[PDB]
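Predicting holo structure, protoporphyrin IX containing FE bound.
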Amino acid sequence: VLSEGEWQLVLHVWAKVEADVAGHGQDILIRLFKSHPETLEKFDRFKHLKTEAEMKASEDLKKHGVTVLTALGAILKKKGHHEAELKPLAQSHATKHKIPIKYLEFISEAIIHVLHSRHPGDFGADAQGAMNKALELFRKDIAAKYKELGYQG
Ligand code: HEM
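Done. Tokens:
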């Protein structure tokens, strides 16, 4: 469980993310794809992109980054009471998109990296720890749904 103080740290930095959802989303997906190239292969939509400059120029990639962060923000603002939001996401990512839990760990790392780069004054070690905890909770609950369906591992 996160404490109320930990949730406040998470949501305070998230409010800053919301000032520029598209720019954060772009940076997070590019970091994911550059650090873990296998992840790009799961996106028929994006797997033609080779270079960072190509990724930065793609409007479609920017659009999907907004989709990702909007969905995550809705989950974080539930402060753990996220069953209705999370279940549909787990179902699509397990059974349609075929995304291993490990790739959710990778995108979590990318989120932390980008938040540190763009919000240092609101993303000190205490806020980093809280955000890590929030993303662990997200992963744990997705993993339980994956296991039900036979996709944990
Ligand atoms: C913070 C974690 C993530 C969130 C909140 C998220 C959210 C979403 C949402 C809202 C959609 C559209 C609705 C749906 O299909 O469920 C989507 C689509 C998709 N996601 Fe994710 N996603 C996450 C992580 C990932 C990761 C790590 C991968 C791959 C490595 C991935 C691959 C896909 C694919 C392939 C689609 C379909 C894209 C298309 O062709 O339109 N997702 N995601």
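Helices lie at 4-17, 21-35, 52-57, 59-76, 83-95, 101-118, 125-149.
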